From Swiss-Prot, chain A:
The gene is MCM4. This is DNA replication licensing factor MCM4. The lineage of its organism: Eukaryota, Metazoa, Chordata, Craniata, Vertebrata. Disulfide bonds: none annotated. It is found in: Nucleus; Chromosome. The keyword Glycoprotein does not apply. ATP 2 binds at residues 301, 338-339. Belongs to the MCM family.
Swiss-Prot record, chain B:
InterPro entries: AAA+_ATPase, MCM, MCM7, MCM_CS, MCM_dom, MCM_lid, MCM_N, MCM_OB. Keywords: Acetylation, ATP-binding, Cell cycle, Chromosome, DNA replication, DNA-binding, Glycoprotein, Helicase, Hydrolase, Isopeptide bond, Nucleotide-binding, Nucleus, Phosphoprotein, Ubl conjugation. ATP 1 binds at residues 309, 340, 342-344, 445. Early fractionation of eukaryotic MCM proteins yielded a variety of dimeric, trimeric and tetrameric complexes with unclear biological significance. Specifically a MCM467 subcomplex is shown to have in vitro helicase activity which is inhibited by the MCM2 subunit. The MCM2-7 hexamer is the proposed physiological active complex. Its EC number is 3.6.4.12. One of its GO terms (cellular component) is nucleus. Belongs to the MCM family. Pfam families: HTH_MCM7, MCM, MCM_lid, MCM_N, MCM_OB. This is DNA replication licensing factor MCM7. ATP 2 binds at residues 470, 557. One of its GO terms (biological process) is DNA damage response.
UniProtKB/Swiss-Prot annotation, chain C:
One of its GO terms (molecular function) is DNA binding. The chain holds residues 61 to 147 of 301 of the full protein. Plays an important role in the control of DNA replication and the maintenance of replication fork stability. Important for cell survival after DNA damage or replication stress. May be specifically required for the ATR-CHEK1 pathway in the replication checkpoint induced by hydroxyurea or ultraviolet light. Forms a complex with TIMELESS and this complex regulates DNA replication processes under both normal and stress conditions, stabilizes replication forks and influences both CHEK1 phosphorylation and the intra-S phase checkpoint in response to genotoxic stress. The keyword DNA damage applies. GO terms for biological process: cell cycle phase transition; cell division; DNA replication checkpoint signaling; mitotic intra-S DNA damage checkpoint signaling; positive regulation of cell population proliferation; regulation of nuclear cell cycle DNA replication; replication fork arrest; replication fork processing. Residues 7-83 are annotated as: Interaction with TIMELESS. It comes from the Eukaryota. Belongs to the CSM3 family. Keywords: Cell cycle, Cell division, Cytoplasm, DNA damage, Mitosis, Nucleus, Phosphoprotein. GO terms for cellular component: chromatin; cytoplasm; nucleoplasm; nucleus; replication fork protection complex. It comes from Homo sapiens. Interacts with TIMELESS (via N-terminus), which impairs TIMELESS self-association. Associates with the MCM2-7 complex. Interacts with RPA2, PRDX2. It is found in: Cytoplasm; Nucleus. This is TIMELESS-interacting protein.
Length: 398, 598, 87
DNA sequence: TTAGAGAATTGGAGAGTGTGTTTTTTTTTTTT
DNA sequence: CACACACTCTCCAATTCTCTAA
């Protein structure tokens, strides 16, 4: 029964927590008028996404104690909030259908900690940290329901994952043969999982220190939402797990390895007919060609015909060997405006690329084959000229 | 032999009764006060001093130093038994609820105790830590080579049983342990209930843990030997005291690492060792009125390297390098010359003066390069990034000797630093960005022999213009005979050899700590240019470009350079707006640097 | 050694057995007419809990299959007619 | 006629035994 | 080596067979 449930050795009542979060959903009309998150639960009905993002600042302003319970005990509270949201989503809009139960995704807008100051006292707390993704692993299939079948008599059964282990049946109920139930891997049920290695942002580092890093794990429906090189404020539970001394022995090292069980991502460095009619009217403006050529590279001075040629390159010819790609060469002394102009213009178009003609280029002009380090298999790493297949390639120190 | 119960009682007596007259004669019971703080959880770490223990029992100090781990346990037990006498977050909540169940001593223990070593024990070098000192409290000096991130170490694991609702506890001592699976309680065993145990990370006692490696000071190693190293394991509040490259003295217990399983039969009676760290220790308005004297600019320029005569305007430029302009902002400069021209001596002075700096050769070093490098540490095999001159110099100045002899990888790395002040490096095929905003102070040779002014600088020094134009000032430290100056220099060198010190110079250099204070408060000023001075900049820049065109290494970067230098002098004047003297100084410094080159 | 529990009549007449089953429903409450499914769920929940406390080794249905046979024995039957009415 | 107490047969839980566990030099081809 | 697979071997006891009373 719900009223009898209390978080273990914590005295926080689960039913009271659920009802308090439902009160938060009911009453929170004031982010600065319907409730904001009930407006979002109206939007979710047509949007179809299986999640509800909520701000921990809003929860704190509504109720300090509810926010404190969320931060202290996310492992129990967040499932309680999920149950609350899924109850509200059928109290309101009772006839709705959704393929999955709604997952609440709390987050603070800004970092609560920086990864150098994480401590064992932060274990199993809800935290959020800022960082840059270094690597992103393959999609790991993680089991969630084990499907067993009798080798003798074809009887089948299903057993839930307890805490990563499996309660293997040991005897078939329909023919009583011991050790006859075999795990059918592809009839079992799996969720998505992915490992993400996150480095602290350069500005957050101390003077001249090498980066610290933390491991993140992102599960189903939140799995492949970040790429290497991007920046994120990531909210998750600071886990600590034992690691076995050897793969064939169950002894574990006394020092626990830690990782972030991700709950929410927020990317921080990534960022109509009205547009159509504005562009159409602007096309009729007098000397629009000079206007656009002058809009190109405001920091650069007097280079009218150069900017005009760059504009004509960026627009390109008529596709249909009938090559429509316009080729432009800038020529002049080192330290002059051409390098700045290239570094400006490469980000002004989709599918664009910038690279050096020297061997220090991050992405080379030539395609090559390399062993992918995380898996040590061959991968055809194409060059910048190929990656820019329908865009501009800016080759500096040509 | 020892009666450790009587030893515990004597330790209780010491903790209860010791006083030391701190705070100018208040007769404070220091350990009683800290016991009150521990009981109230306002303090977690208790550094008991064996110098204090020596003042009433030298035999107890000897017993501690000879059997330190035993007495660490005894002191901790005595403190825990005495906390209720002086008892006037999540684990606190769990201890409260377990007290409710009473209404696992190591779990309920929420403090830590350490021995601050006695002064009679000399601080050893790592090489002097012999096998006879195993299990004994030792003080060891060394450089901190490398430090791991703080990790949670399980001290007392806590499990809950699904069937019988009972907590079970597992104290942890060894570096490895067996996690419990099936429930040991008799209500599970007698009923054959098949109940199993789930670890509760929330209700189990962890501790901060950090692994570092100390290394011998280079000037203390014997002649023909590699420097030795020692693993130091750090726990609790001792963590995060040290950093890589730091000089420390560590009081700790020299102990063996007792590995498990296959390593035991392989190693036999031999064992690796670690140092269980207990203590880690790390090795103005009158002055502002002196700074207020309007001589201060030239006073500082004189204080810069009195061992080198002349080049006073170069010294002024070096001062502005340490000051920096408005935030870009780094005054990168380069000063070419022949070998032995006192060029290296000047760069060495800047490296010594500057608070954050590095000094290296452009060539080819067998050390870590200008970029950082990834070491392996194969006893663990865990690859880690380390060093890099540019990275170590990040907030300050990096001095490069024989810049001309750099490899192309080094040239591209410096180009990246000049462009965006960060570098790229790979750990295990994967790669990261690593931050370095240091100013570059470059010293370079002619490609062959003494410099000839008939040849242009890029053709003579053999460096690409894409790099060589980055530096705000280009100076040529040419050396030629001059009888009286040669004799003065010789007298200086001979006095240095004869007395191991600089001779008196008829003036007093300012204290480098005071110079550091001065440039710090100077760098905290944030100038801005007014429009009239911008017009003055425009006029001066166009006239200077006429001169350069008539005699070509002048561009928009020249205007930005003079702006940077003028803002640097505004910082030097410690005023938040530039003035005509700033632009005049920038213009003349650039002009006379070109004259030095000519 | 070999301290394996058995679930025979001595187990059933222990404190946790029929003497407990006489009392476990003192706290219970039922809704009655038209809600027999909910009352049945509460009833099975209470007696399933009682079975688990009495002999945790078995699943509830297997425990019922055991006990429905085991009630025929004379010791537990005499204790039954004691529990019925009173001593 | 139906059901409980004493004796006989076989399943398997548990104890014991045996076995398994980057970094340097030298060459070769091709890149400049 | 000390911690896991695989096999053998031992005795406990779980369930049925047979004789007797209600
Ligand atoms: Zn079967
Ligand atoms: Zn148990």
């Amino acid at each position: 029964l719900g009223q009898k449930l209390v978080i273990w050795g914590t005295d926080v009542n689960v039913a009271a927590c659920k009802e308090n979060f439902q009160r938060f959903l009911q009453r929170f009309i004031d982010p600065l008028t319907e409730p904001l998150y009930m407006q979002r639960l109206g939007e979710i009905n047509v949007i179809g996404e299986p999640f509800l993002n909520v701000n921990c600042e809003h929860i704190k302003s509504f109720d300090k104690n509810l926010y404190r319970q969320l931060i202290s005990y996310p492992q129990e509270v967040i499932p309680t909030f999920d149950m609350a949201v899924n109850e509200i989503f059928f109290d309101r809009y009772p006839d709705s259908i959704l393929e999955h139960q709604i997952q609440v995704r709390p987050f603070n807008a800004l970092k609560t900690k920086n990864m150098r100051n994480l401590n064992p006292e932060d274990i199993d707390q809800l935290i959020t940290i800022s960082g840059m993704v270094i690597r992103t692993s393959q999609l790991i299939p993680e089991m969630q329901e084990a499907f067993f079948q009798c080798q003798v008599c074809a009887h089948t059964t299903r057993v839930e994952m307890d805490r990563g282990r499996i309660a293997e049946p040991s005897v078939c109920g329909r023919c009583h043969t011991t050790h006859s139930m075999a795990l059918i891997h592809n009839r079992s049920l799996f969720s998505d999982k992915q490992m993400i290695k996150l480095q602290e942002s350069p500005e957050d580092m101390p003077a001249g220190q090498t980066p610290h890093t933390v491991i993140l794990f992102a599960h189903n429906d939140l799995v492949d939402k970040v790429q290497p090189g991007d920046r994120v404020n990531v909210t998750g539970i600071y886990r600590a797990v034992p690691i076995r001394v050897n793969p064939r022995v169950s002894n574990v090292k006394s020092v626990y390895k830690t990782h972030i069980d991700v709950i929410h991502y927020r990317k921080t460095d990534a960022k109509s007919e009205k547009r159509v009619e504005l562009l159409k009217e602007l096309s009729r403006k007098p000397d629009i060609y000079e206007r656009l050529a002058s809009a190109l590279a405001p920091s650069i001075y007097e280079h009218e015909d150069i900017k005009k040629g760059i504009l004509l390159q960026l627009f390109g010819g008529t596709r249909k060997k009938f090559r429509a790609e316009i080729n432009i060469l800038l020529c002049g002394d080192p330290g002059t405006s051409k390098s700045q102009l290239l570094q400006y213009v490469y980000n002004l178009v989709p599918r664009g690329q910038y690279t050096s003609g020297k061997g220090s280029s991050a992405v080379g002009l030539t395609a090559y084959v390399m062993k992918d380090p995380e898996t040590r298999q061959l991968v055809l790493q194409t060059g910048a000229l190929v990656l820019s297949d329908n865009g501009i390639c800016c080759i500096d120190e040509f | 032999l020892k009666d450790y119960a009587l030893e515990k009682e004597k330790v209780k007596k010491f903790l209860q009764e010791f006083y030391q007259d701190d705070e100018l004669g208040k007769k404070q019971f220091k350990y009683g006060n800290q016991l009150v703080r521990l009981a109230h959880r306002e303090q977690v770490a208790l550094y008991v001093d064996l110098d204090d223990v020596a003042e009433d029992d030298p035999e107890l100090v000897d017993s501690i130093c000879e059997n330190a781990r035993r007495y660490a346990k005894l002191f901790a037990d005595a403190v825990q038994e005495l906390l209720p006498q002086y008892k006037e977050d999540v684990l606190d909540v769990y201890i409260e609820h377990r007290l409710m169940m009473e209404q696992p001593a190591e779990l309920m223990r929420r403090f830590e105790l350490y021995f601050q070593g006695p002064s009679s024990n000399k601080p050893r070098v790592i090489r002097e830590v012999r096998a006879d000192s195993v299990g004994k409290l030792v003080t060891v000096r060394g450089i901190v080579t490398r430090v791991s991130e703080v990790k949670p170490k399980m001290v007392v694991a806590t499990y809950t049983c699904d069937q019988c609702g009972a907590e079970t506890y597992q104290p942890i001592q060894s570096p490895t342990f067996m996690p419990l699976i099936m429930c040991p309680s008799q209500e599970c065993q007698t009923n054959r209930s098949g109940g199993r145990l789930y670890l509760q990370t929330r209700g189990s006692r962890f501790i901060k843990f950090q692994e570092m490696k100390m290394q011998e000071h280079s000037d203390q190693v014997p002649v023909g030997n590699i420097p030795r190293s020692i693993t130091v394991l750090v726990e609790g509040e001792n963590t995060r005291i040290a950093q890589p490259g730091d000089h420390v003295s560590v009081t700790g217990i020299f102990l063996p690492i007792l590995r498990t399983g296959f390593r035991q039969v392989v190693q036999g009676l031999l064992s690796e060792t670690y140092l269980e760290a207990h203590r880690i220790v790390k090795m103005t308005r009158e002055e502002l009125r002196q700074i207020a004297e309007e001589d201060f600019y030239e006073k500082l320029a004189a204080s810069i390297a009195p061992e080198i005569y002349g080049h006073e305007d170069v010294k002024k430029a070096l001062l502005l390098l340490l000051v920096g302009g408005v935030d870009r902002g780094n005054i990168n400069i380069c000063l070419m010359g022949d070998p032995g021209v006192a060029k290296s001596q000047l760069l060495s002075y800047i490296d010594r003066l500057a608070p954050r700096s590095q000094y290296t050769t452009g060539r080819g070093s067998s050390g870590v390069g200008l970029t950082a490098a990834v070491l392996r540490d194969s006893v663990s095999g865990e690859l880690t990034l380390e060093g890099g001159a540019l990275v170590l110099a990040d907030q300050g100045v990096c001095c490069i000797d024989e810049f001309d002899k750099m490899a192309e990888a080094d040239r591209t790395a410096i180009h990246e630093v000049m462009e965006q002040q960060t570098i790229s490096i790979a750990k295990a095929g994967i790669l990261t960005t690593l931050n370095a905003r240091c100013s570059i102070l470059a010293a370079a040779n002619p490609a062959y022999g003494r410099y000839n002014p008939r040849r242009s600088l890029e053709q003579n020094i053999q460096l690409p213009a894409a790099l060589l134009s980055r530096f705000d000032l280009l100076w040529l430290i040419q050396d030629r005979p001059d009888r009286d100056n040669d004799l003065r220099l010789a007298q200086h060198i001979t006095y240095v050899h004869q007395h191991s010190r600089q001779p008196p110079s008829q003036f007093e250099p300012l204290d480098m700590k005071l110079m550091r204070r001065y440039i710090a408060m100077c760098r905290e000023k944030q100038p801005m240019v007014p429009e009239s001075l911008a017009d003055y900049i425009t006029a001066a820049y166009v006239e200077m470009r006429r001169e350069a065109w008539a005699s070509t290494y002048t561009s928009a970067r020249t205007l930005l350079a003079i702006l940077r230098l003028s803002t640097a002098l505004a910082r030097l004047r410690m005023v938040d707006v530039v003035e005509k003297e700033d632009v005049n100084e920038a213009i003349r410094l650039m002009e006379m640097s070109k004259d030095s080159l000519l | 050694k070999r301290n394996i529990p058995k679930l025979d009549a001595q187990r059933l007449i222990s404190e946790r057995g029929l003497p407990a089953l006489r009392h476990v429903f003192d706290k219970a409450k039922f809704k009655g007419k038209g809600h027999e499914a909910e009352d049945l769920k509460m009833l099975i929940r209470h007696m399933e809990h009682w079975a688990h406390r009495l002999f945790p080794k078995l699943q509830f249905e297997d425990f019922i299959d055991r006990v429905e046979y085991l009630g025929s024995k004379k010791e537990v039957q005499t204790c039954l007619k004691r529990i019925r009415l009173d001593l």
